[PDB]
Design a protein around this motif. Structure first.
Motif, short mmCIF file in Angstrom:
data_model
loop_
_atom_site.label_atom_id
_atom_site.label_comp_id
_atom_site.label_asym_id
_atom_site.label_seq_id
_atom_site.Cartn_x
_atom_site.Cartn_y
_atom_site.Cartn_z
N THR A 13 -5.91 5.41 3.91
CA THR A 13 -6.40 4.04 4.10
C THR A 13 -6.29 3.42 5.49
N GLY A 14 -5.37 3.92 6.30
CA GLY A 14 -5.19 3.34 7.62
C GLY A 14 -4.19 2.21 7.54
N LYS A 15 -3.84 1.83 6.32
CA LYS A 15 -2.89 0.74 6.10
C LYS A 15 -1.48 1.25 5.77
N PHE A 18 3.79 -0.47 3.35
CA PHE A 18 4.48 -1.75 3.43
C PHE A 18 3.88 -2.35 4.67
N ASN A 104 -8.49 -7.25 -0.82
CA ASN A 104 -8.39 -8.66 -0.46
C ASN A 104 -7.08 -9.02 0.26
N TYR A 107 -4.59 -11.03 -1.45
CA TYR A 107 -3.95 -10.50 -2.66
C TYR A 107 -2.77 -9.63 -2.25
#
Lengths: 122, 122, 122, 122, 122, 122, 122, 122
Positions: A13-15, A18, A104, A107
């Motif tokens: 995801t690249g995210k 945490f 989101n 979220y």
């Protein structure tokens, strides 16, 4: 697996797990009451449901290996748990990615006690 | 209740009241003079009018509960006000969701000389 | 004048009226009710008041000229209005620049429930 | 020279000359009427005055070369003109970079008819 | 009547004519050579062609007045040229708004000499 | 040509080379070691490969002309290189456009440990 | 230690490794070829060199512990590698902090033709 | 009191307590181990200490009221607890506003298990 699951996720995801996914919605990071907020939250419920099929394992501490081959994550097979646990984590990572389109930002940090639906079943 | 309305909005529109709706147009987050800017603004005018039919209640402060069945927001009934305040909030959250397609970020910081028409009737 | 004022703002504050000031607080870009939010907002209240001393002019639409000497705004005086209007604008731009140290971006999209008090007297 | 100057600019500042500097302030890309808006707008006036001392040459067109020895611009000595136009360009690129801390994105697109000041003396 | 056109544009798009449209693409703010970069550019070529059906008048200068009404710009009818000119202006403003969904932030400032197409025929 | 390519990219993709493509993946704007990251990246690799079939040319500096029918780019003929170099750029420019749907802004600042694969073979 | 190092970056710099440093210049996050862009990059080069004096270790993956006492990082000693790895990390974290005064965001997405120089000497 | 404190927070800083301060640094939202990450984080510690001076009360839950005169928070005195608690909440709200100049968004979510310092002694 915590290490392996984390790796798979930033990778897919690249995210950084945490804080992008550790408290997202009602189920990312744990949770049994929904309903889910979106598809991303669903990937998480599925993941939990998945871990629940491995009572003979320790999905959180079980360390395992995995490789990449033409874009797909390939789970090792040295032991039963490693394989199954890896398959659970592999699936959630791919799901999170396929659903980045509706991820989101607001979220990301969702108050757990806002989830009051019945306890999910799987 | 302003608290519960905030959840509905976050859960429905997918945005957080602040800053997405606390300053939208001539009526979102407050205001009496129009004319409303667009569909979203009008949702808030209608919301404001709905609250005017509850002079026997305190919509901003009376805390109420709600549930989600089949994806729909189901208002509680412990007291008529709570039920009635809750129904007003549900409508605005759904009306906001319905009009995300014409949501204009700039109306979130509209020219200070815009809402200077005469008070709208409900 | 509205045109000449903007350029003053632009040259003095380094910010463009839109969206930096056209909606700042209770008085920038327009508004009659406060209380003012800060030093910047008060500059605009004073500007509003200053305009009110020119009922024999059209502050907002009567164009005029001005020069810069030694880095200062110098108003023209072809007509008395042009002179007095220009002085009002010069004053606000200077007050705006002077208060950049407390410029709050959030007051650019403040809650719609603010600025609903008494009308400030000049 | 448009090229060498162009090259130097992105190399030193990191902003594509067009549209970042071709119309900044009153003097970037040309202009005799000020006053300058900031330090950046002053680097461009200094540049112009440096070309004003080359009736010796055609500084806007003349072509030349330069090296990047130890992270700096070293001009060639092929011919007087070539060498002196390169020093004009080297000086302005460095100047612009050095002043990037006050570069104002809202000065990037400045209409020159707002520059009423009298023709600039060198 | 660069005043009427200017007003119509921020009012309809939320963008300041300068610098958001004064040099956009190949035709915004003048130009006979394309092809147009996109819808927005096509609104402008349209506008200029419209002005060409007015040799009868002087589009960029004849002042005039309009009524906003119910969200539809409404032109005046005191003189022919004011009506005809106002209609060309209104059309470009409504066209720009309608195509804000493809407005490209890096077409905002587009060098004219990059537009080599033949002289556009209306 | 580097200039001509950039213009082609702005016209076709709607994105300015900097910072949209000058640092994308393992090959856009430079790089030899793969593996390429995605479709956009392979466009560049192919482009880089296209340049290797022009050892007798200077594709990066050799200037050329080109026109635009309606939307298609048409390469000049004056010389063999200009045509060959130009066709290379038209190729990438068009490739970059066709693959906008999977353009990943994160690959613009991808991990510094990512391009250690084997030098790609054309 | 990659995990411990990241936590030191967050602590010491106030920036998260992603995306503030994972792709900074020629050495942060990876890279062996310079020249290094600036002081920050140079910190990373020194770190890379530091990691090299630990062939007997697994700096990137050997996990260690550390504490923060009176504003300073205090490494562990359970084993030699853990101590040395930690010291390498501590120094870069502090180094990165010490040079926040020249941190350049553009170096986060530098041109892809920018780090193909000689392999730097330790 | 989660209401009073929550309200004081947004009012004073413009940030929603959740998620902007509910897990900031090592001490926001509770916690007894540091060291503090920055100015903001210390406010909370100081806040936790304040509560500790009220063992005879229930600061986290006990309800109370306050007024806002000329921009300051004015605690009530119905009971001693309500007064002492309120002054604690106000202090932290003021402390937060006062240090927004260093509020770090990378600290908004800080893993509490990363705070290993010794139990803070007020």
């Amino acid at each position: 697996s915590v290490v392996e699951l984390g790796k798979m996720i930033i990778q897919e995801t690249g995210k950084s797990p945490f804080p992008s996914y550790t408290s997202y919605g009602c189920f990312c990071g744990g949770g049994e009451r929904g309903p889910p907020l979106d598809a991303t939250d669903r990937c998480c419920l599925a993941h939990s449901c998945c871990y629940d099929t491995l009572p003979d394992c320790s999905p959180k501490t079980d360390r395992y290996k995995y490789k990449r081959e033409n874009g797909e994550i390939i789970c090792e097979n040295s032991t039963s748990c490693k394989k199954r646990i890896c398959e659970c984590d592999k699936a959630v990572a791919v799901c999170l990615r396929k659903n980045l389109n509706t991820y989101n930002k607001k979220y990301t940090y969702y108050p757990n006690f806002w989830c009051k639906g019945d306890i999910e079943k799987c």
